[PDB]
Design a protein around this ligand. Sequence first.
Ligand SMILES: *[C@@H]1O[C@H](CO)[C@@H](O[C@@H]2O[C@H](CO)[C@@H](O[C@@H]3O[C@H](CO[C@H]4O[C@H](CO)[C@@H](O)[C@H](O)[C@@H]4O)[C@@H](O)[C@H](O[C@H]4O[C@H](CO)[C@@H](O)[C@H](O)[C@@H]4O)[C@@H]3O)[C@H](O)[C@H]2NC(C)=O)[C@H](O)[C@H]1NC(C)=O
Ligand SMILES: *[C@@H]1O[C@H](CO)[C@@H](O[C@@H]2O[C@H](CO)[C@@H](O[C@@H]3O[C@H](CO[C@H]4O[C@H](CO)[C@@H](O)[C@H](O)[C@@H]4O)[C@@H](O)[C@H](O[C@H]4O[C@H](CO)[C@@H](O)[C@H](O)[C@@H]4O)[C@@H]3O)[C@H](O)[C@H]2NC(C)=O)[C@H](O)[C@H]1NC(C)=O
Ligand SMILES: *[C@@H]1O[C@H](CO)[C@@H](O[C@@H]2O[C@H](CO)[C@@H](O[C@@H]3O[C@H](CO[C@H]4O[C@H](CO)[C@@H](O)[C@H](O)[C@@H]4O)[C@@H](O)[C@H](O[C@H]4O[C@H](CO)[C@@H](O)[C@H](O)[C@@H]4O)[C@@H]3O)[C@H](O)[C@H]2NC(C)=O)[C@H](O)[C@H]1NC(C)=O
Ligand SMILES: *[C@@H]1O[C@H](CO)[C@@H](O[C@@H]2O[C@H](CO)[C@@H](O)[C@H](O)[C@H]2NC(C)=O)[C@H](O)[C@H]1NC(C)=O
Ligand SMILES: *[C@@H]1O[C@H](CO)[C@@H](O[C@@H]2O[C@H](CO)[C@@H](O)[C@H](O)[C@H]2NC(C)=O)[C@H](O)[C@H]1NC(C)=O
Ligand SMILES: *[C@@H]1O[C@H](CO)[C@@H](O[C@@H]2O[C@H](CO)[C@@H](O)[C@H](O)[C@H]2NC(C)=O)[C@H](O)[C@H]1NC(C)=O
Ligand SMILES: *[C@@H]1O[C@H](CO)[C@@H](O[C@@H]2O[C@H](CO)[C@@H](O)[C@H](O)[C@H]2NC(C)=O)[C@H](O)[C@H]1NC(C)=O
Ligand SMILES: *[C@@H]1O[C@H](CO)[C@@H](O[C@@H]2O[C@H](CO)[C@@H](O)[C@H](O)[C@H]2NC(C)=O)[C@H](O)[C@H]1NC(C)=O
Ligand SMILES: *[C@@H]1O[C@H](CO)[C@@H](O)[C@H](O)[C@H]1NC(C)=O
Ligand SMILES: *[C@@H]1O[C@H](CO)[C@@H](O)[C@H](O)[C@H]1NC(C)=O
Ligand SMILES: *[C@@H]1O[C@H](CO)[C@@H](O)[C@H](O)[C@H]1NC(C)=O
Ligand SMILES: *[C@@H]1O[C@H](CO)[C@@H](O)[C@H](O)[C@H]1NC(C)=O
Ligand SMILES: [Ca+2]
Ligand SMILES: [Ca+2]
Ligand code: NI
Ligand code: NI
Lengths: 350, 1048, 6, 5, 5
Amino acid sequence: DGTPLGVGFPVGIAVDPARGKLYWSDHGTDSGVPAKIASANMDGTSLKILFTGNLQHLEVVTLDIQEQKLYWAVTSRGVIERGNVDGTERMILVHHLAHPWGLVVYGSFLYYSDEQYEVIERVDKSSGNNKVVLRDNVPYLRGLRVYHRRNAADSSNGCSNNPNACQQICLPVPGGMFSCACASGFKLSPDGRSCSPYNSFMVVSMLPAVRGFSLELSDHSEAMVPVAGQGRNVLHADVDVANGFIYWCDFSSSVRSSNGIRRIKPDGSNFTNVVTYGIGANGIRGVALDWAAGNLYFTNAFVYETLIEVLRINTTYRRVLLKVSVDMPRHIIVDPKHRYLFWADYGQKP
Amino acid sequence: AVDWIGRNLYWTDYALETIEVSKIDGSHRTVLISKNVTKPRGLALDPRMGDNVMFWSDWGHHPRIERASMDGTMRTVIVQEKIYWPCGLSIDYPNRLIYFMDAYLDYIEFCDYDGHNRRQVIASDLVLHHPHALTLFEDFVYWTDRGTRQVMQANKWHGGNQSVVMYSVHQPLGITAIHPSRQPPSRNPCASASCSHLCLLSAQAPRHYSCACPSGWNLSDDSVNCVRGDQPFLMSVRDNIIFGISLDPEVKSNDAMVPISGIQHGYDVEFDDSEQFIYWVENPGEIHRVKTDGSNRTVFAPLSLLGSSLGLALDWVSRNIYYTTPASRSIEVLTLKGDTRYGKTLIANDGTPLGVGFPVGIAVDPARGKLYWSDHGTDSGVPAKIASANMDGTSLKILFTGNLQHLEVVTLDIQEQKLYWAVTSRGVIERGNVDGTERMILVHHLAHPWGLVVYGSFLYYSDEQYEVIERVDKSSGNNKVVLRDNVPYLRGLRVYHRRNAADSSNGCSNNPNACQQICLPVPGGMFSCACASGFKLSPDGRSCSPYNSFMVVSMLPAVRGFSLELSDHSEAMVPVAGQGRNVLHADVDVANGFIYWCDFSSSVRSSNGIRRIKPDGSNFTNVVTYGIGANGIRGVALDWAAGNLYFTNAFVYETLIEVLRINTTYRRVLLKVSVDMPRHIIVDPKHRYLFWADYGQKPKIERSFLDCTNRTVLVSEGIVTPRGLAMDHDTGYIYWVDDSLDLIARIHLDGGESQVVRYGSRYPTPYGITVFGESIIWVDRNLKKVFQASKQPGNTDPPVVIRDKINLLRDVTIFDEHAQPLSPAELNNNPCLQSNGGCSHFCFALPELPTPRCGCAFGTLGNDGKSCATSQEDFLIYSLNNSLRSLHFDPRDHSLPFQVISVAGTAIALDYDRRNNRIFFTQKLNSLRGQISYVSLYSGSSSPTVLLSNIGVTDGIAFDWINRRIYYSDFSNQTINSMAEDGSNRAVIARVSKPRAIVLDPCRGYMYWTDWGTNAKIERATLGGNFRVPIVNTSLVWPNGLALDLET
Amino acid sequence: XXLXXX
Amino acid sequence: XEEXX
Amino acid sequence: XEEXX
Ligand SMILES: *[C@@H]1O[C@H](CO)[C@@H](O[C@@H]2O[C@H](CO)[C@@H](O[C@@H]3O[C@H](CO[C@H]4O[C@H](CO)[C@@H](O)[C@H](O)[C@@H]4O)[C@@H](O)[C@H](O[C@H]4O[C@H](CO)[C@@H](O)[C@H](O)[C@@H]4O)[C@@H]3O)[C@H](O)[C@H]2NC(C)=O)[C@H](O)[C@H]1NC(C)=O
Ligand SMILES: *[C@@H]1O[C@H](CO)[C@@H](O[C@@H]2O[C@H](CO)[C@@H](O[C@@H]3O[C@H](CO[C@H]4O[C@H](CO)[C@@H](O)[C@H](O)[C@@H]4O)[C@@H](O)[C@H](O[C@H]4O[C@H](CO)[C@@H](O)[C@H](O)[C@@H]4O)[C@@H]3O)[C@H](O)[C@H]2NC(C)=O)[C@H](O)[C@H]1NC(C)=O
Ligand SMILES: *[C@@H]1O[C@H](CO)[C@@H](O[C@@H]2O[C@H](CO)[C@@H](O[C@@H]3O[C@H](CO[C@H]4O[C@H](CO)[C@@H](O)[C@H](O)[C@@H]4O)[C@@H](O)[C@H](O[C@H]4O[C@H](CO)[C@@H](O)[C@H](O)[C@@H]4O)[C@@H]3O)[C@H](O)[C@H]2NC(C)=O)[C@H](O)[C@H]1NC(C)=O
Ligand SMILES: *[C@@H]1O[C@H](CO)[C@@H](O[C@@H]2O[C@H](CO)[C@@H](O)[C@H](O)[C@H]2NC(C)=O)[C@H](O)[C@H]1NC(C)=O
Ligand SMILES: *[C@@H]1O[C@H](CO)[C@@H](O[C@@H]2O[C@H](CO)[C@@H](O)[C@H](O)[C@H]2NC(C)=O)[C@H](O)[C@H]1NC(C)=O
Ligand SMILES: *[C@@H]1O[C@H](CO)[C@@H](O[C@@H]2O[C@H](CO)[C@@H](O)[C@H](O)[C@H]2NC(C)=O)[C@H](O)[C@H]1NC(C)=O
Ligand SMILES: *[C@@H]1O[C@H](CO)[C@@H](O[C@@H]2O[C@H](CO)[C@@H](O)[C@H](O)[C@H]2NC(C)=O)[C@H](O)[C@H]1NC(C)=O
Ligand SMILES: *[C@@H]1O[C@H](CO)[C@@H](O[C@@H]2O[C@H](CO)[C@@H](O)[C@H](O)[C@H]2NC(C)=O)[C@H](O)[C@H]1NC(C)=O
Ligand SMILES: *[C@@H]1O[C@H](CO)[C@@H](O)[C@H](O)[C@H]1NC(C)=O
Ligand SMILES: *[C@@H]1O[C@H](CO)[C@@H](O)[C@H](O)[C@H]1NC(C)=O
Ligand SMILES: *[C@@H]1O[C@H](CO)[C@@H](O)[C@H](O)[C@H]1NC(C)=O
Ligand SMILES: *[C@@H]1O[C@H](CO)[C@@H](O)[C@H](O)[C@H]1NC(C)=O
Ligand SMILES: [Ca+2]
Ligand SMILES: [Ca+2]
Ligand code: NI
Ligand code: NI
């Protein structure tokens, strides 16, 4: 979102199972989130900005759980830095690196790989000091990790103490508590444990995909399983609240059969083509659904003609209402309450 | 549309959305109608006295056909009903009817001048698909269709009697009927007018003319005289066009100057009010200019050979223009005065933060001699910053730094000494003092600021994402005013205004013509003389001399030279770049002033070869082009003493070490190997040794004599992929680099142990090395840097970076007289220094001997020991395209028995005549024109003497040494015929389907030949052609070759 | 054919 | 003659 | 080939 607390361009992730806090490194966005090191509860509740400053080409972040200090690398300055999770103490650990890509802290040593030096090096986690080379002349180096024994007994939280507490997803929070979550397109029930479909949300349609966002701005989750993938080029979308459907019209100038009107439930099921036959040279340029009578209104946009059509849902009856040549209706909204149709025209004589 | 009475010229511009008028000479143009017009397509006008009226058609959001007086005053709308796409107009002068057309409603109609008596010529008809333009004649109307791509004719009153005039492959847009009746005469009221500049006809009764004047001119109260408007205006450069818009937001005309159309990728502009010129850069690396009225739109100078320039700033006192080259990481200057252009690079990208990382904007202060630029920084020492320096490039300083991600152009307020800039990452415009003390945010919540300029009490900025040009108060950023809106592709801004050089004079104006080439002002009223690229300032402080000491850094795209002193960022040589450059290694000829390099291309030929150029960019000539292997020239070494150029050309499975005597055609091979692959070769005339590196199977470094005869290995253990090697002559050590070992090491010429100079992770890919004085200089491919460090092993000082962010580094060499000594004492009395040692072709010195071993390019060395003659022995001869070439029987002897003989046409077969010492060979010309000739092998070596012409293609030839007559076969004519050695009598021996080769046995009276026709066989007959029999006539298909051995 | 002459 | 990806 | 760009 517009606030600095949101994710701008997240690169790395570190998780602290006990004490329940996420940590991530962000490249920032223009006129929005800065490039910063941020932290939040693993359910996403309390966004926070820990370190901001000379970070430009920020690399992945990592966490030393035993010492509770964050590590990250800045390519624009060629350094590896440390910082407490409190966001207070910050210092430079290694100098004169070329392009750090991955780094990991285990035991008393810190391992980092430089993609431009084509090397993997080990240094102490308190300071550079004893530099040791593990591999050299290795091209295309990337991130690193240490495979080691960590058990559920050495650290525990709410989601481990209470299995089967949440029906779909359990997310720990600081203090030993746990927060239940319900997938995508589902909303947490008032009991706090079960799941129900997202009764109230808003629909935004992009050319690549159709997505749903909740009205309450504190909820960053997707309120609807996104409609995306190959063959998607969305011009408009309309909703059917009672029957639980979302109608959208695809467009394609070159490839046919990519034109028409489709339907889908907000949970991602029962995909079905509604209108496929008789689409004009320019696709369906507008869609409007009459939730009272069950009528669907849409606009066909031929090269020199424009039709306004009706289709009764779950029914093959399809009718043309208007045929115009000098006027070009484009976007249709229907009002069953006052029984009117309003459409916008942006051709000659708008 | 031309005005034949008033001698004017009208046109409609769809992109500019204006209707413009000028004289018929194309001068004094102005924007006539610019209000309330969106898409003007059609245009017609009636210059007759009774009308003086013009018509145009606009197909905007509200289509209409409008009329107005020819001076644009009395504008009315005549057709705005039943029109969707008005396209094309024409006037019927006799009866005063205006014909118009519509491409959407598909009709042709006409009306009177008031648009009242509307009739349909062609309507509700399918003859019209997408008609564009029309013209009239006597009772006929012609029009063009862009849909059916044909020109039509019909009756102009009812549309009957239609026919197709013309079919056209492309869409026919314009059409006019040329005849005097279409252009009726009348009285010219404008002919008596006293108006300066433009005199436009009008429909007003008293006078029927009205004076007007071009864009940027003022209409005086006399109503006949105009004066140039000196008021300022804003130049709004956009991605494809530059507009001059007035500073008054109420004026929406965009006609303060003639628009500068045809821009490729516009970023910013720059002006010189002394000559009223507007400057902008172009992508190919050029700077263009044009006057405010469009008189001398021309190119002006080339900016950089290795990338396009982005920023622009002009000094109106010293008459220099500064620009930034982000592709080359440099800030450069160019000279406007004089007919000869001089350019220099001021600041480059060294390792220090004070250097130039990625210059975006630049603003100059001619007085006080200060230059400011905004830097994006790099993934290196250079951060994002606002930096300042003197205009001679000396005192680099960092003024502001911090949260400056995605910086934009920087603007200087000279009157207040305040810097202004925009930051996209935070969407703000900030300002601060030139000394770097104060800083505050002035404008908030911007989307993507691109341009900004300070003039008077206001700050103008253009936002590329809001598509708006806005004026705000420069002191506080309050009182926002919108000038333009909904304009896409918004780019930088600049205010054109008159600025006198006298009120802001500097050192370069008080002392003109002091410096030979370039003058650069400095703080304190002084000036600093400077020289163009490739020249060094002489100690006298005024003249210029070419660089005599610089390093030649070799890259794949270009070959560039840098000074040995790190404080000098000037380009020490004119860069070699452009089309066709893909260079592997370079070498220098200091004494003569030449730099050699080898270009390589894996696909296209004629790109491989060795070429030479002077360090000032004069007399580029090719050196070696013929006979380059598939892998191209892989190493260049020049013997500055003997004038020999050694190189290694690699084939797919072989590689040769080859010598070419410079300025001469003498070229010979010294060594041919398959297991070894010598790649980089160096030569040492002092110790008289030849070294090279090998990085194939069994990598090593080899040492050998100048003739490649005493090959020994110096390093063969702990070495993989030695990219390059270099030598310091004063100490006699060989330095080499290993990218596969991250190792830089050295070893003495006589051998011993290898000394590790530098190694470790911090040396990923060293690709080329050189030695100068106490320091080694090498390039690193991965780090994109050119380093300098102490030559002595065991040193722990970090290397200093000469330059940074150079892509595709390959090699580095020193261009200095100290690195190529010429005195006999400094070369250990090397022979071949005088008269090439007396040798005729090649002069190879030997390590301790006082007499040179002369080499022979072709032939054998005589008893004299310094002259060459023909082999006088047995050898092979073969024909290769248009030449006859020779070869020795010994595979280990690479000398040519005789120099290649050049012939006309293509040589196919040949045979040798002992007695006269000549070669009888055949030629092929055209498809069927064969030919037979002979050439002597004696010292005369005249042009080949022809024996016959106009004969068919000949596939073989044999000579009878006993009977002194020549036998040859004609493929195209299916006969084998004979001839005397003088030509003379000719006879036919036999007929054959496809004869190729012939062999003779005169001492037994028999003659053999081969045939590969429908049935392939080898036939025998007497030399007279009698008793023909086939010797072998089974299992043969294409028996091309025949040879007879008398010894067995 | 589209209207724009370009 | 309209908008498309 | 070995290197071309
Ligand atoms: C064209 O044809 C399609 C099918 O191809 C129809 O789609 C169906 O529409 C009906 C409309 O009633 C849908 O039925 C509704 O389902 C809702 C979800 O059910 C879940 O949650 C409820 C609890 O809220 C559980 O009981 C249930 O088991 C599920 O877990 C229900 O909430 C709706 O309840 C309403 O009706 C019931 C029964 O009468 C009442 O008891 C309730 O009070 C309430 O009024 C309802 O049952 C059905 O899910 C749709 N199926 C599909 C495949 O999507 C379209 O309706 C039809 N088009 C048009 C325009 O008519
Ligand atoms: C051709 O026609 C054009 C348009 O009529 C004339 O242009 C005007 O010329 C006058 C005189 O030079 C200009 O007046 C000056 O304006 C300055 C500020 O202008 C800016 O701000 C105003 C609004 O505040 C805008 O309208 C304007 O576009 C600019 O953005 C003032 O600072 C000047 O004041 C100073 O000089 C005057 C007179 O000497 C003093 O009295 C003041 O104390 C002060 O020192 C001055 O008022 C006017 O702005 C111009 N308009 C335009 C559109 O630029 C040409 O002059 C005319 N040419 C000729 C030769 O006839
Ligand atoms: C193959 O063929 C090429 C030509 O195609 C030859 O190249 C020429 O080489 C000679 C040297 O052998 C060059 O001559 C030199 O020119 C220099 C530049 O002269 C300018 O600057 C000087 C002052 O520095 C002015 O006096 C002069 O007017 C010019 O403005 C001179 O500096 C050199 O002088 C040196 O040698 C002379 C004697 O020759 C001494 O008297 C001087 O003291 C000084 O030591 C010299 O004159 C010539 O310019 C080259 N021509 C071209 C076209 O490049 C190659 O030499 C030839 N051989 C090989 C192996 O390549
Ligand atoms: C530009 O076209 C517009 C639209 O027709 C004109 O605006 C109208 O002009 C008439 C003139 O009588 C007025 O009666 C209306 O009140 C105007 N409407 C608006 C919204 O302004 C406008 O006059 C035209 N301008 C020019 C210079 O041609
Ligand atoms: C094409 O031209 C012919 C004449 O060559 C037209 O035919 C005559 O038109 C006049 C005027 O309408 C009539 O009075 C005559 O009776 C016509 N004679 C014939 C032979 O038809 C014809 O009208 C033109 N084409 C069209 C369709 O108008
Ligand atoms: C701008 O254009 C004009 C017109 O071509 C140039 O003036 C001509 O210059 C040539 C060569 O000096 C003369 O032979 C003509 O007589 C000139 N014609 C006129 C109309 O004066 C002018 O030189 C150009 N400006 C510059 C400096 O390039
Ligand atoms: C092979 O020989 C032919 C001639 O038989 C060469 O053709 C000539 O090429 C030159 C350019 O190098 C032209 O200027 C001549 O006009 C050509 N002559 C004829 C008769 O066509 C050809 O170039 C040779 N091929 C190579 C690779 O050198
Ligand atoms: C291939 O060559 C042999 C050469 O002998 C031909 O054999 C002769 O054929 C003729 C005609 O049949 C006989 O009269 C001879 O007696 C044969 N000679 C011998 C010694 O065999 C043979 O005919 C040739 N083949 C073809 C297809 O021409
Ligand atoms: C809708 O979806 C359910 C579950 O995917 C499926 O079983 C059912 O057949 C579908 N019904 C229709 C009419 O699409
Ligand atoms: C070297 O350059 C100048 C300028 O082109 C030329 O006049 C001179 O002839 C050239 N030298 C040779 C030998 O080509
Ligand atoms: C060069 O090669 C010859 C023949 O192999 C050998 O005898 C000689 O010692 C070598 N070196 C010198 C000093 O000539
Ligand atoms: C073949 O012989 C013919 C006539 O018998 C002669 O005209 C011609 O020149 C010869 N070959 C060619 C070139 O066709
Ligand atoms: Ca049409
Ligand atoms: Ca390496
Ligand atoms: Ni990175
Ligand atoms: Ni930007």
